[PDB]
Amino acid sequence: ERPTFYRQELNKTIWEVPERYQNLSPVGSVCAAFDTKTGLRVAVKKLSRPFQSIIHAKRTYRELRLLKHMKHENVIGLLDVFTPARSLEEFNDVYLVTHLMGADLNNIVKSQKLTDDHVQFLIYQILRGLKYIHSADIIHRDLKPSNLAVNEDSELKILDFATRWYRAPEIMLNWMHYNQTVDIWSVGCIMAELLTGRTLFPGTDHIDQLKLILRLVGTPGAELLKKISSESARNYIQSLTQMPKMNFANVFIGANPLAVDLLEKMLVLDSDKRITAAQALAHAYFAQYHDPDDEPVADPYDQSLESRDLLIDEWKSLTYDEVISFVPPPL
Ligand SMILES: Cc1ccc(-n2nc(C(C)(C)C)cc2NC(=O)Nc2nc(CCOCc3ccccc3)cs2)cc1
Ligand SMILES: CCCCCCCCO[C@@H]1O[C@H](CO)[C@@H](O)[C@H](O)[C@H]1O
C-alpha cells in the first residue's frame, strides 16, 4: 500500500513526506527526522531542482543508482527513497533517507591527537569501506575528514559531496587516468593526521601542496620518469634537485612501529606501488580488528549506463523506475 503523506513547510520549500517520518527539522536541501517504523534518527535529502537541466537529471539518476546499490556497514547506503507522486507525469520530486550520523571525522576529534588503538579502528573502518567501494570499480577521488560520517562510538561511514590537503599528487597535477590508490593517499594523509594531531600536507595552494609532498616522499624516482608521457612535466621533473625520501620514524616520533610501516606503503609517490585497500586490511597493524571472513565485496557496478546522452524525459523515466523498484534494508 502507498503510505499516507503530509504537507509541511520549513523554508521556501513544500516538503511532502510519509507519516513514518516525524519531528522534522531543517539542517542545511536536507532535513533531519525521526523514523517511527524503524526507531532510528534519519536525515532526509530532498533533491534540489531534480530535472532542471540534463545535468541535473543525470546527477539525480546517478546519485540514486549508486546509493541504491550501496550496502555496507562503513558506506552510506539507503534506508528509503520516496516520492509523493502516484505516476510518472506528476513525478517531479525525489527524497532520499539514510540514518543520521552525528558528526564528521573533523569534529569527533580532528582537533587533538588521538590514540593508536583509536586510529587503528578508525582507519580499519575506512579501509573496510574502501575495499567494498573499490571492488565496485569505483574511486572516491575526494576522500577527506569532512567526508567521513562518525557516530558517538567511532562507527565510520564514507560519503561524497582546505580541501586539496588530502588529494593525491597525480590529481593535483591532473594526469587524466588514475586508479583506486588515489584514495589510499587520502587515507595516509588522514591517518598521519590522526597520529600526530597535525595536518601532514598543510598546502596553501596547488604548488605548495605539491612541494610539501616531495619534501617527505622525495622527488620522482628514475623508474617513475618512464611513466610520465607529458614532455611538459617530464622535463620539469628532471630540472629539480633530487630529494631523498625522508625517514618516517623521525617524522612520526613515538608512533606505533607498525603504523609507521603502513604509512610508508600507503604514501608511495608512485600510485602503481601503493598498497591496495584489500592488502592494507591484512597488514599486521590491524590484527586486532581484521576479520578476513567479514570484509565483503560488492557486485560490479555499471558506470557506463549512467554516462549517456538522453533527453530530460528519458532520465525522468529511468529515475522513476528506480524509486518504484527500491526495496528497503532489513533490521
Ligand atoms: C553525483 C554524485 C556523486 C557521488 C555520490 N556519492 N557517492 C557516494 C559514495 C562514493 C558511494 C560514498 C556517496 C554519494 N552520495 C553522497 O555522499 N550523498 C550525500 N548527500 C548528502 C547531503 C545531505 O546528507 C543527507 C543524506 C540523506 C540521504 C542520503 C544521503 C545523504 C550528504 S552525503 C552521489 C552523487
Ligand atoms: C612531481 C611529479 C609527481 C609525480 C606524481 C605521479 C605519481 C602517480 O603515479 C602514477 O599514477 C598514474 C595514474 O594513477 C599512472 O599513469 C602511472 O602508472 C603511475 O605511476
GROMACS .gro file of C-alpha atoms and ligand atoms in nm:
model
  386
    1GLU     CA    1   0.000   0.000   0.000
    2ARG     CA    2   0.112   0.355  -0.079
    3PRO     CA    3   0.155   0.506   0.272
    4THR     CA    4  -0.002   0.832   0.389
    5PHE     CA    5   0.191   1.154   0.327
    6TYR     CA    6   0.167   1.508   0.463
    7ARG     CA    7   0.237   1.865   0.355
    8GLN     CA    8   0.489   2.071   0.558
    9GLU     CA    9   0.682   2.395   0.504
   10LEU     CA   10   1.020   2.474   0.663
   11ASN     CA   11   1.200   2.727   0.441
   12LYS     CA   12   1.095   2.819   0.084
   13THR     CA   13   1.004   2.453   0.030
   14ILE     CA   14   0.700   2.223   0.042
   15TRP     CA   15   0.838   1.901   0.192
   16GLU     CA   16   0.590   1.618   0.137
   17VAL     CA   17   0.685   1.310   0.343
   18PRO     CA   18   0.522   0.990   0.486
   19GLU     CA   19   0.383   0.993   0.841
   20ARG     CA   20   0.654   0.734   0.918
   21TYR     CA   21   0.900   1.028   0.940
   22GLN     CA   22   0.836   1.267   1.229
   23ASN     CA   23   0.954   1.579   1.423
   24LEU     CA   24   1.104   1.714   1.102
   25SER     CA   25   1.381   1.976   1.137
   26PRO     CA   26   1.593   2.154   0.865
   27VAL     CA   27   1.975   2.114   0.876
   28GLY     CA   28   2.138   2.292   0.581
   29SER     CA   29   1.821   2.074   0.085
   30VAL     CA   30   1.819   1.845   0.389
   31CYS     CA   31   1.606   1.786   0.700
   32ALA     CA   32   1.653   1.554   0.998
   33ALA     CA   33   1.360   1.341   1.117
   34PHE     CA   34   1.255   1.050   1.338
   35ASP     CA   35   1.154   0.730   1.160
   36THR     CA   36   0.877   0.559   1.353
   37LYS     CA   37   0.875   0.226   1.166
   38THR     CA   38   1.244   0.164   1.249
   39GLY     CA   39   1.301   0.376   1.562
   40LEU     CA   40   1.614   0.544   1.423
   41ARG     CA   41   1.706   0.908   1.369
   42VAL     CA   42   1.731   0.984   0.996
   43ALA     CA   43   1.845   1.259   0.761
   44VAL     CA   44   1.618   1.314   0.462
   45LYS     CA   45   1.758   1.470   0.144
   46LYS     CA   46   1.504   1.646  -0.078
   47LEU     CA   47   1.666   1.670  -0.420
   48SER     CA   48   1.743   2.021  -0.544
   49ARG     CA   49   1.597   2.112  -0.886
   50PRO     CA   50   1.555   1.745  -0.983
   51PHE     CA   51   1.500   1.789  -1.357
   52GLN     CA   52   1.614   2.149  -1.415
   53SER     CA   53   1.881   2.060  -1.671
   54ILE     CA   54   2.004   1.744  -1.843
   55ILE     CA   55   2.294   1.776  -1.598
   56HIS     CA   56   2.053   1.773  -1.303
   57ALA     CA   57   1.851   1.470  -1.411
   58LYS     CA   58   2.181   1.298  -1.491
   59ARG     CA   59   2.312   1.383  -1.143
   60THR     CA   60   1.990   1.273  -0.965
   61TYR     CA   61   1.975   0.941  -1.154
   62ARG     CA   62   2.343   0.874  -1.076
   63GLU     CA   63   2.312   0.954  -0.704
   64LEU     CA   64   2.023   0.710  -0.664
   65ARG     CA   65   2.161   0.407  -0.851
   66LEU     CA   66   2.484   0.445  -0.652
   67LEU     CA   67   2.340   0.456  -0.301
   68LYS     CA   68   2.062   0.219  -0.401
   69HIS     CA   69   2.345  -0.018  -0.493
   70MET     CA   70   2.542   0.070  -0.180
   71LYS     CA   71   2.506  -0.182   0.102
   72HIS     CA   72   2.791  -0.181   0.357
   73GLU     CA   73   2.837  -0.115   0.730
   74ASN     CA   74   3.101   0.151   0.651
   75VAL     CA   75   2.948   0.312   0.338
   76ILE     CA   76   2.636   0.531   0.319
   77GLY     CA   77   2.351   0.312   0.196
   78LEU     CA   78   1.982   0.399   0.174
   79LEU     CA   79   1.713   0.330   0.433
   80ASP     CA   80   1.444   0.455   0.194
   81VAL     CA   81   1.359   0.664  -0.110
   82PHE     CA   82   1.008   0.801  -0.167
   83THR     CA   83   0.802   1.030  -0.387
   84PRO     CA   84   0.457   1.182  -0.331
   85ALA     CA   85   0.370   1.108  -0.695
   86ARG     CA   86   0.137   0.820  -0.785
   87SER     CA   87   0.251   0.845  -1.151
   88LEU     CA   88   0.532   0.946  -1.387
   89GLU     CA   89   0.366   1.260  -1.531
   90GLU     CA   90   0.313   1.417  -1.187
   91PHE     CA   91   0.655   1.294  -1.069
   92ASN     CA   92   0.888   1.588  -1.007
   93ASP     CA   93   1.043   1.544  -0.660
   94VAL     CA   94   1.291   1.299  -0.501
   95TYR     CA   95   1.353   1.242  -0.128
   96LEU     CA   96   1.636   1.017  -0.006
   97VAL     CA   97   1.661   0.878   0.351
   98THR     CA   98   1.963   0.748   0.547
   99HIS     CA   99   2.045   0.709   0.919
  100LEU     CA  100   2.173   1.036   1.066
  101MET     CA  101   2.534   1.026   1.186
  102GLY     CA  102   2.605   1.292   1.449
  103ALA     CA  103   2.927   1.432   1.309
  104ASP     CA  104   3.224   1.403   1.072
  105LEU     CA  105   3.585   1.300   1.147
  106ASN     CA  106   3.679   1.668   1.182
  107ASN     CA  107   3.470   1.717   1.494
  108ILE     CA  108   3.470   1.378   1.652
  109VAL     CA  109   3.835   1.470   1.724
  110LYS     CA  110   4.047   1.618   1.442
  111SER     CA  111   4.132   1.898   1.685
  112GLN     CA  112   4.353   1.698   1.926
  113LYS     CA  113   4.588   1.397   1.875
  114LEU     CA  114   4.429   1.050   1.913
  115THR     CA  115   4.547   0.709   2.040
  116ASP     CA  116   4.687   0.425   1.828
  117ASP     CA  117   4.402   0.191   1.923
  118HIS     CA  118   4.161   0.466   1.822
  119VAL     CA  119   4.327   0.527   1.486
  120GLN     CA  120   4.358   0.150   1.419
  121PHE     CA  121   3.981   0.104   1.450
  122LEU     CA  122   3.913   0.424   1.260
  123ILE     CA  123   4.146   0.350   0.966
  124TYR     CA  124   4.039  -0.015   0.970
  125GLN     CA  125   3.683   0.103   0.902
  126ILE     CA  126   3.767   0.344   0.615
  127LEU     CA  127   3.980   0.068   0.467
  128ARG     CA  128   3.699  -0.182   0.517
  129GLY     CA  129   3.481   0.058   0.319
  130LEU     CA  130   3.736   0.146   0.051
  131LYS     CA  131   3.767  -0.226  -0.018
  132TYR     CA  132   3.393  -0.250  -0.085
  133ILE     CA  133   3.381   0.075  -0.283
  134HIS     CA  134   3.688  -0.026  -0.489
  135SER     CA  135   3.556  -0.374  -0.568
  136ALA     CA  136   3.258  -0.200  -0.728
  137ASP     CA  137   3.504  -0.046  -0.978
  138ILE     CA  138   3.468   0.297  -0.805
  139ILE     CA  139   3.727   0.556  -0.699
  140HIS     CA  140   3.618   0.813  -0.439
  141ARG     CA  141   3.856   1.090  -0.559
  142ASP     CA  142   3.758   1.323  -0.274
  143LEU     CA  143   3.834   1.138   0.050
  144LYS     CA  144   3.886   1.368   0.348
  145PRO     CA  145   3.764   1.410   0.711
  146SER     CA  146   3.458   1.624   0.621
  147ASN     CA  147   3.355   1.326   0.403
  148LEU     CA  148   3.356   1.056   0.671
  149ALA     CA  149   3.050   1.005   0.887
  150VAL     CA  150   3.111   0.912   1.252
  151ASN     CA  151   2.862   0.843   1.531
  152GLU     CA  152   2.939   0.883   1.904
  153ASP     CA  153   3.102   0.534   1.909
  154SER     CA  154   3.354   0.582   1.624
  155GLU     CA  155   3.146   0.382   1.373
  156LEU     CA  156   3.252   0.525   1.040
  157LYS     CA  157   3.078   0.583   0.706
  158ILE     CA  158   3.210   0.711   0.372
  159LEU     CA  159   3.005   0.962   0.169
  160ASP     CA  160   3.055   1.226  -0.103
  161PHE     CA  161   2.951   1.589  -0.163
  162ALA     CA  162   4.131   2.334   0.285
  163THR     CA  163   4.004   2.057   0.057
  164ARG     CA  164   4.310   1.977  -0.156
  165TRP     CA  165   4.506   1.881   0.160
  166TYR     CA  166   4.418   1.513   0.118
  167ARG     CA  167   4.439   1.478  -0.262
  168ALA     CA  168   4.690   1.251  -0.436
  169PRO     CA  169   4.969   1.430  -0.629
  170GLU     CA  170   4.851   1.282  -0.961
  171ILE     CA  171   4.516   1.458  -0.908
  172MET     CA  172   4.676   1.794  -0.818
  173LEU     CA  173   4.872   1.766  -1.143
  174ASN     CA  174   4.570   1.623  -1.327
  175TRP     CA  175   4.701   1.310  -1.506
  176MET     CA  176   4.370   1.220  -1.667
  177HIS     CA  177   4.397   0.845  -1.596
  178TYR     CA  178   4.417   0.715  -1.241
  179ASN     CA  179   4.346   0.414  -1.022
  180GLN     CA  180   4.199   0.337  -0.681
  181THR     CA  181   4.523   0.410  -0.492
  182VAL     CA  182   4.434   0.781  -0.507
  183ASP     CA  183   4.203   0.712  -0.214
  184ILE     CA  184   4.483   0.527  -0.031
  185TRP     CA  185   4.682   0.852  -0.048
  186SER     CA  186   4.388   1.021   0.123
  187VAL     CA  187   4.390   0.756   0.396
  188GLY     CA  188   4.761   0.811   0.455
  189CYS     CA  189   4.710   1.187   0.498
  190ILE     CA  190   4.406   1.117   0.714
  191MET     CA  191   4.591   0.857   0.920
  192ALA     CA  192   4.909   1.066   0.951
  193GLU     CA  193   4.699   1.349   1.093
  194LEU     CA  194   4.526   1.121   1.346
  195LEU     CA  195   4.870   1.011   1.467
  196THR     CA  196   5.048   1.347   1.506
  197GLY     CA  197   4.747   1.574   1.565
  198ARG     CA  198   4.882   1.794   1.283
  199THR     CA  199   4.794   1.808   0.912
  200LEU     CA  200   5.057   1.619   0.706
  201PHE     CA  201   5.049   1.843   0.397
  202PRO     CA  202   4.919   2.186   0.501
  203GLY     CA  203   4.916   2.322   0.146
  204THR     CA  204   4.839   2.690   0.098
  205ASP     CA  205   4.780   2.638  -0.277
  206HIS     CA  206   4.827   2.380  -0.555
  207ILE     CA  207   5.208   2.415  -0.579
  208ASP     CA  208   5.273   2.443  -0.205
  209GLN     CA  209   5.066   2.124  -0.167
  210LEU     CA  210   5.282   1.956  -0.434
  211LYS     CA  211   5.609   2.092  -0.295
  212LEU     CA  212   5.534   1.970   0.059
  213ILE     CA  213   5.458   1.622  -0.074
  214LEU     CA  214   5.801   1.584  -0.234
  215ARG     CA  215   5.962   1.712   0.089
  216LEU     CA  216   5.854   1.387   0.251
  217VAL     CA  217   5.838   1.122  -0.023
  218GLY     CA  218   6.133   1.258  -0.221
  219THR     CA  219   6.147   1.355  -0.589
  220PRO     CA  220   6.024   1.112  -0.856
  221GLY     CA  221   6.242   0.802  -0.895
  222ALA     CA  222   6.408   0.714  -1.227
  223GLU     CA  223   6.151   0.434  -1.261
  224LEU     CA  224   5.867   0.689  -1.241
  225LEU     CA  225   6.000   0.907  -1.526
  226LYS     CA  226   5.927   0.614  -1.759
  227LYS     CA  227   5.554   0.658  -1.694
  228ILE     CA  228   5.528   1.034  -1.744
  229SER     CA  229   5.407   1.073  -2.105
  230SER     CA  230   5.392   1.454  -2.095
  231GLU     CA  231   5.713   1.627  -2.206
  232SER     CA  232   5.571   1.941  -2.044
  233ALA     CA  233   5.604   1.784  -1.696
  234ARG     CA  234   5.877   1.533  -1.784
  235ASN     CA  235   6.143   1.798  -1.845
  236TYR     CA  236   6.041   1.985  -1.530
  237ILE     CA  237   6.064   1.666  -1.320
  238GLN     CA  238   6.428   1.643  -1.429
  239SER     CA  239   6.525   2.007  -1.359
  240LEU     CA  240   6.469   1.950  -0.985
  241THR     CA  241   6.744   1.873  -0.732
  242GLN     CA  242   6.682   1.507  -0.640
  243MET     CA  243   6.533   1.455  -0.293
  244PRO     CA  244   6.586   1.157  -0.065
  245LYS     CA  245   6.255   1.027   0.076
  246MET     CA  246   6.250   1.128   0.445
  247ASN     CA  247   6.277   0.874   0.726
  248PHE     CA  248   5.922   0.819   0.852
  249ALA     CA  249   6.031   0.725   1.207
  250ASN     CA  250   6.169   1.076   1.254
  251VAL     CA  251   5.850   1.218   1.104
  252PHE     CA  252   5.626   1.007   1.328
  253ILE     CA  253   5.810   1.044   1.656
  254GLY     CA  254   5.698   0.796   1.923
  255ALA     CA  255   5.430   0.645   1.699
  256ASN     CA  256   5.344   0.278   1.656
  257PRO     CA  257   5.625   0.084   1.480
  258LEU     CA  258   5.364  -0.086   1.254
  259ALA     CA  259   5.163   0.232   1.188
  260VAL     CA  260   5.485   0.381   1.054
  261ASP     CA  261   5.532   0.081   0.823
  262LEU     CA  262   5.176   0.123   0.699
  263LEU     CA  263   5.223   0.495   0.623
  264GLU     CA  264   5.524   0.412   0.403
  265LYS     CA  265   5.337   0.153   0.198
  266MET     CA  266   5.043   0.394   0.163
  267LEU     CA  267   5.212   0.726   0.084
  268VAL     CA  268   5.408   0.600  -0.214
  269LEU     CA  269   5.454   0.878  -0.467
  270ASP     CA  270   5.405   0.626  -0.749
  271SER     CA  271   5.042   0.501  -0.741
  272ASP     CA  272   5.125   0.164  -0.904
  273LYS     CA  273   5.340   0.097  -0.598
  274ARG     CA  274   5.088   0.197  -0.327
  275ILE     CA  275   4.906  -0.069  -0.124
  276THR     CA  276   4.559  -0.189  -0.232
  277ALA     CA  277   4.274  -0.131   0.015
  278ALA     CA  278   4.240  -0.510   0.045
  279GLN     CA  279   4.611  -0.556   0.110
  280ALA     CA  280   4.607  -0.283   0.375
  281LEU     CA  281   4.339  -0.472   0.569
  282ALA     CA  282   4.574  -0.774   0.602
  283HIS     CA  283   4.859  -0.556   0.735
  284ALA     CA  284   4.986  -0.651   1.082
  285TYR     CA  285   4.869  -0.313   1.217
  286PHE     CA  286   4.502  -0.416   1.213
  287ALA     CA  287   4.548  -0.764   1.366
  288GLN     CA  288   4.305  -0.651   1.640
  289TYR     CA  289   4.010  -0.568   1.414
  290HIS     CA  290   4.091  -0.752   1.088
  291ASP     CA  291   3.827  -1.018   1.027
  292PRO     CA  292   3.920  -1.166   0.686
  293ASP     CA  293   3.585  -1.350   0.688
  294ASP     CA  294   3.386  -1.024   0.718
  295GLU     CA  295   3.534  -0.784   0.465
  296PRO     CA  296   3.284  -0.837   0.183
  297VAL     CA  297   3.298  -0.716  -0.174
  298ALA     CA  298   3.023  -0.554  -0.381
  299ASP     CA  299   2.891  -0.664  -0.718
  300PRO     CA  300   3.042  -0.486  -1.016
  301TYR     CA  301   2.863  -0.153  -1.077
  302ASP     CA  302   2.769  -0.027  -1.426
  303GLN     CA  303   2.918   0.325  -1.463
  304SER     CA  304   2.854   0.313  -1.838
  305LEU     CA  305   2.471   0.310  -1.814
  306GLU     CA  306   2.491   0.632  -1.610
  307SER     CA  307   2.715   0.823  -1.856
  308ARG     CA  308   2.480   0.865  -2.154
  309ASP     CA  309   2.312   1.131  -2.371
  310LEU     CA  310   1.938   1.100  -2.316
  311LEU     CA  311   1.659   1.357  -2.301
  312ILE     CA  312   1.521   1.523  -1.986
  313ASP     CA  313   1.217   1.296  -2.010
  314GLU     CA  314   1.433   0.989  -2.072
  315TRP     CA  315   1.621   1.029  -1.744
  316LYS     CA  316   1.297   1.115  -1.560
  317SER     CA  317   1.158   0.775  -1.665
  318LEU     CA  318   1.478   0.585  -1.586
  319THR     CA  319   1.500   0.756  -1.246
  320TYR     CA  320   1.130   0.697  -1.168
  321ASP     CA  321   1.158   0.322  -1.228
  322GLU     CA  322   1.439   0.317  -0.970
  323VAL     CA  323   1.213   0.461  -0.698
  324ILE     CA  324   0.941   0.207  -0.780
  325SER     CA  325   1.198  -0.073  -0.771
  326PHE     CA  326   1.363   0.015  -0.437
  327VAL     CA  327   1.327  -0.234  -0.153
  328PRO     CA  328   1.442  -0.111   0.192
  329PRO     CA  329   1.702  -0.291   0.405
  330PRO     CA  330   1.618  -0.528   0.695
  331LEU     CA  331   1.654  -0.460   1.071
  332LIG     C1  332   2.675   1.295  -0.824
  332LIG     C2  333   2.711   1.205  -0.706
  332LIG     C3  334   2.845   1.177  -0.676
  332LIG     C4  335   2.876   1.095  -0.567
  332LIG     C5  336   2.773   1.041  -0.488
  332LIG     N1  337   2.803   0.961  -0.385
  332LIG     N2  338   2.892   0.876  -0.390
  332LIG     C6  339   2.897   0.814  -0.272
  332LIG     C7  340   2.994   0.701  -0.236
  332LIG     C8  341   3.118   0.711  -0.326
  332LIG     C9  342   2.924   0.567  -0.257
  332LIG    C10  343   3.036   0.716  -0.091
  332LIG    C11  344   2.804   0.865  -0.192
  332LIG    C12  345   2.746   0.959  -0.265
  332LIG     N3  346   2.646   1.036  -0.224
  332LIG    C13  347   2.656   1.112  -0.115
  332LIG     O1  348   2.759   1.114  -0.047
  332LIG     N4  349   2.548   1.184  -0.086
  332LIG    C14  350   2.535   1.270   0.017
  332LIG     N5  351   2.447   1.370   0.020
  332LIG    C15  352   2.449   1.446   0.131
  332LIG    C16  353   2.354   1.564   0.150
  332LIG    C17  354   2.266   1.551   0.276
  332LIG     O2  355   2.302   1.443   0.365
  332LIG    C18  356   2.190   1.356   0.391
  332LIG    C19  357   2.167   1.243   0.312
  332LIG    C20  358   2.041   1.184   0.311
  332LIG    C21  359   2.020   1.072   0.231
  332LIG    C22  360   2.123   1.020   0.153
  332LIG    C23  361   2.249   1.079   0.154
  332LIG    C24  362   2.270   1.191   0.233
  332LIG    C25  363   2.542   1.410   0.222
  332LIG     S1  364   2.623   1.276   0.161
  332LIG    C26  365   2.640   1.069  -0.520
  332LIG    C27  366   2.609   1.151  -0.628
  333LIG     C1  367   5.633   1.597  -0.947
  333LIG     C2  368   5.558   1.477  -1.010
  333LIG     C3  369   5.480   1.396  -0.905
  333LIG     C4  370   5.452   1.254  -0.954
  333LIG     C5  371   5.303   1.219  -0.939
  333LIG     C6  372   5.263   1.097  -1.023
  333LIG     C7  373   5.265   0.970  -0.938
  333LIG     C8  374   5.143   0.882  -0.966
  333LIG     O1  375   5.182   0.750  -1.015
  333LIG     C9  376   5.129   0.729  -1.148
  333LIG     O2  377   4.986   0.729  -1.148
  333LIG    C10  378   4.930   0.738  -1.281
  333LIG    C11  379   4.778   0.717  -1.271
  333LIG     O3  380   4.738   0.682  -1.137
  333LIG    C12  381   4.981   0.633  -1.382
  333LIG     O4  382   4.982   0.689  -1.513
  333LIG    C13  383   5.122   0.581  -1.352
  333LIG     O5  384   5.128   0.445  -1.395
  333LIG    C14  385   5.160   0.591  -1.203
  333LIG     O6  386   5.298   0.565  -1.186
   0.00000   0.00000   0.00000
